[PDB]
Amino acid sequence: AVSKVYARSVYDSRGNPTVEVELTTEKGVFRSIVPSGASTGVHEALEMRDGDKSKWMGKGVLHAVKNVNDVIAPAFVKANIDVKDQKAVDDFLISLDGTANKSKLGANAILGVSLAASRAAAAEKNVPLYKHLADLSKSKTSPYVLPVPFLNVLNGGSHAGGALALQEFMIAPTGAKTFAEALRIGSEVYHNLKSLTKKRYGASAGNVGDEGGVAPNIQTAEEALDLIVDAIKAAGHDGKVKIGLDCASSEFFKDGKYDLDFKNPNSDKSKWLTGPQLADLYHSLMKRYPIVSIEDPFAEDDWEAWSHFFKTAGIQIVADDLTVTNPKRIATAIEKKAADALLLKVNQIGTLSESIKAAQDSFAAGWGVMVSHRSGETEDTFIADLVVGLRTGQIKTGAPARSERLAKLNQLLRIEEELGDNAVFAGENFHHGDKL
């Protein structure tokens, strides 16, 4: 029984204010913190900011916070809802906002309540969060599946200063036998990468991006990939580690063309690429490097481009800004055969229930599901329990550096240990972890 709902302003991993919510019950106080992206898709739910340039550079969230305290709270408490009933909770919240993109109260106002409720519910059932989560989603729990982590060891695009267009370059230790081993191999590659990087491009190149990866000032994907393969090799893990990319192409799409030098204000329009051209580029990288997954190869509404590449790709193709964890967007994606994996971001849609549906819809279509954090994270470890609850077999929560990332990775170590013989690591079958 909820006796209280309260919100406050806290800081994210980038030093920007964010919403933190606290829910009180007979069982105790439950907390949750909302994340925040940088390369946020146009179709994402509304993230409300104060816009006051005299405070936090106009990035405060007093309004959103106010909505929780002044509007949401009173009613919620009055409603007397069963926290164990996620759908109920969410329905209430959505009903309260009334808009399609949560423009009334704001997604960051709603999310926090939604997430806090699930925590309170788990306490009530006297079960671990990932367990309640599996319950909510009707996932198979025998056994549970530990996912393969996709570590963004090299940052580009909007996550770091430099010429690199592509946003994330990740390593996936699909060759590990357990979650612990995977993370060990992952950090080993990471340390080698930092050394090489400094060695090949100067000390400064070893400084890090928003997500904790090294951020060398290079201009081609080839140079980034060469470093990674050399690092994997130097670490002694060749063949056990694969690569995944996050192109975040919408960030550089302009006038129906893709600008690979978009970070340069004086970019050369003649160099801009067409969908098909960009597809040729991707293909070149695929043939040369052990890439097993590409995210956002084409812009958020460039449907034809995704569908075209999809038929020749032959590897996991993840939709991020294209789907925005929105069941309706996914249906279209599914119809157009544009991708084969969903990038799940609680904050793109705004409610847990809606996110769980997105996952269920994807899995129903034979798609894969990759749970993810946002570039602006917090000490909150929700997603760790989530990926296990949903049995996706794959997560992306950063490089093995910067605590907003390790918190989730460490959390996964604790769960694996707890589960013992009741869990298996996804390994090479990460694409369809849910079916393991």
Determine if 173 is a binding residue for its own copies (CB under 8 A).
no
Find out whether 168 is annotated in a ligand binding site.
yes
Span of 2-10, 30-38, 307-315, 399-407 interacting with Mg ion by CB under 5 A: 30-38
* Residue window 240-279: x/- pattern of binding to Mg ion, with contact defined by CB under 5 A: ------x-x-------------------------------
CB atoms < 10 A from the CB of 271, how many?
A: 11
Determine if 399 is a binding residue for its own copies (CB under 8 A).
yes
Determine if 286 is a binding residue for its own copies (CB under 8 A).
no
Q: Is 211 a catalytic residue?
A: yes
179-199 in b/e form (b: 16+ CB < 10 A) is beebbebbbbbbebbbebbbe
Q: Which of residues 7-26 bind its own copies (CB under 8 A)?
A: 8, 10-16, 20
CB 241 within 8 A of CB 182: no
The single residue among 410, 422, 428, 435 that binds its own copies, judged by CB under 8 A, is: 410
What residue 215 binds from Mg ion, its own copies, none (CB within 5 to 8 A, per partner kind)?
A: its own copies
Q: How far is the CB of 160 from Mg ion (least distance, A)?
A: 14
* Residue window 228-267: x/- pattern of binding to its own copies, with contact defined by CB under 8 A: -----------------------------------x----
Find out whether 396 is annotated in a ligand binding site.
yes
Of 326, 278, 331, nearest in space to 302 by CA: 278
Find out whether 132 is annotated in a ligand binding site.
no
Determine if 404 is a binding residue for its own copies (CB under 8 A).
yes
Pick 149 or 427: Cβ nearer Mg ion: 149
Determine if 211 is a binding residue for its own copies (CB under 8 A).
no
Q: How far is the CB of 377 from its own copies (least distance, A)?
A: 6
Find out whether 362 is annotated in a ligand binding site.
no
Select which of 20, 47, 211, 300 is catalytic. 211
The Cα 50–Cα 277 span in angstroms is 41
Q: Which of residues 51-90 bind its own copies (CB under 8 A)?
A: 55-57
Determine if 320 is a binding residue for Mg ion (CB under 5 A).
yes
Pick 136 or 160: Cβ nearer Mg ion: 160
3-state SS, the chain, equals CCCEEEEEEEECCCCCEEEEEEEEECCEEEEEECCECCCCCCCCCCCCCCCCCCCHHHCCCHHHHHHHHHHHHHHHHHHCCCCCCHHHHHHHHHHHHCCCCCCCCCHHHHHHHHHHHHHHHHHHHCCCHHHHHHHHHCCCCCCEEECEECEEEEECHHHCCCCCCCCEEEEECCCCCCHHHHHHHHHHHHHHHHHHHHHHHCHHHHCECCCCCECCCCCCHHHHHHHHHHHHHHHCCCCCCEEEEECCHHHHEECCEECCCCCCCCCCCCCCECHHHHHHHHHHHHHHCCEEEEECCCCCCCHHHHHHHHHHHCCEEEECCCCCCCHHHHHHHHHCCCCCEEEECHHHHCCHHHHHHHHHHHHHCCCEEEEECCCECCCCCHHHHHHHHCCCCEEECCCCCCHHHHHHHHHHHHHHHHHHHHEEECHHHHHHHHHC
Select which of 194, 345, 357, 408 is catalytic. 345
Pick 39 or 316: Cβ nearer Mg ion: 39
Determine if 384 is a binding residue for its own copies (CB under 8 A).
no
The single residue among 112, 147, 209, 297 that binds its own copies, judged by CB under 8 A, is: 209
Find out whether 373 is annotated in a ligand binding site.
yes
What residue 131 binds from Mg ion, its own copies, none (CB within 5 to 8 A, per partner kind)?
A: none
- What residues are designated binding site for Mg(2+)? 246, 295, 320
- What residues are designated binding site? 159, 168, 246, 295, 320, 372-375, 396
Q: Which residues are catalytic?
A: 211, 345
Chain residues that interact with its own copies, rule: CB under 8 A: 8, 10-16, 20, 55-57, 160-163, 183-184, 187-188, 190-191, 198, 202-209, 212, 215, 217, 263, 377-379, 399-407, 409-410, 413-414, 417
- What residues are designated binding site for substrate? 159, 168, 295, 320, 372-375, 396
Chain residues that interact with Mg ion, rule: CB under 5 A: 37, 39, 246, 248, 320
